[PDB]
Design a binder for these strands. Structure first.
Ligand SMILES: [Mg+2]
Ligand SMILES: [Mg+2]
Ligand SMILES: [Mg+2]
Length: 105
RNA sequence: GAGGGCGCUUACCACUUUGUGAUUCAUGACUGGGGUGAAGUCGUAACAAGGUAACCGUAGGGGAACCUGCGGUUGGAUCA
């Protein structure tokens, strides 16, 4: 409760119980997520509110309320896990490989 | 004179000092795990004969669940 300003920002990473949310200028600010969110991936623009600082200048987390629509999505299914999206909202993929340990085709 | 007092000295001895142990708390860089986490990643181990029967003890291997070797058990299916 006691949430802040609704704004648009880019989610840095995913940690299950919470996520790292970059603001509109480059501020690393970790936030937890809303219970009704079906999925949240790396680099997905969201609507979020950065809580409220209990101490003056010292805040713990905010919340991520809503998730914007997906431009692209990287969904890969799995045995006994179902279809899980990995990342979203991307224009280019770079397949990176190495000769060691193997280079398959 | 007898005797007493003062004073001095000795014995006992608190406090105190050094050397060096035992014990306890606070702090402590660092470090060992373990627990709590519904949606994160990695895999599919076990529960059916769970797709190499599983488990216990021990040795070795490797991100990991685990795997191999030896021995034992049925808390194993199917089997005469
Ligand atoms: Mg298995
Ligand atoms: Mg098995
Ligand atoms: Mg055996």
């Amino acid at each position: 409760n006691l949430f802040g300003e609704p704004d648009e920002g880019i989610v840095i990473s995913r940690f299950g119980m919470h996520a790292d949310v970059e603001s509109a200028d480059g501020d690393v600010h970790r936030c937890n997520i809303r219970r009704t969110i079906r999925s949240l991936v790396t680099g997905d623009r969201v609507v979020w509110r950065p809580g409220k600082p209990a101490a003056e200048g010292v805040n713990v987390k905010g919340i991520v309320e809503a998730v914007h629509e997906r431009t692209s999505v990287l969904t890969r299914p799995d045995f006994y896990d179902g279809v899980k999206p990995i990342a979203a909202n991307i224009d280019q993929i770079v397949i990176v490989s190495a000769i060691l340990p193997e280079l398959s085709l």
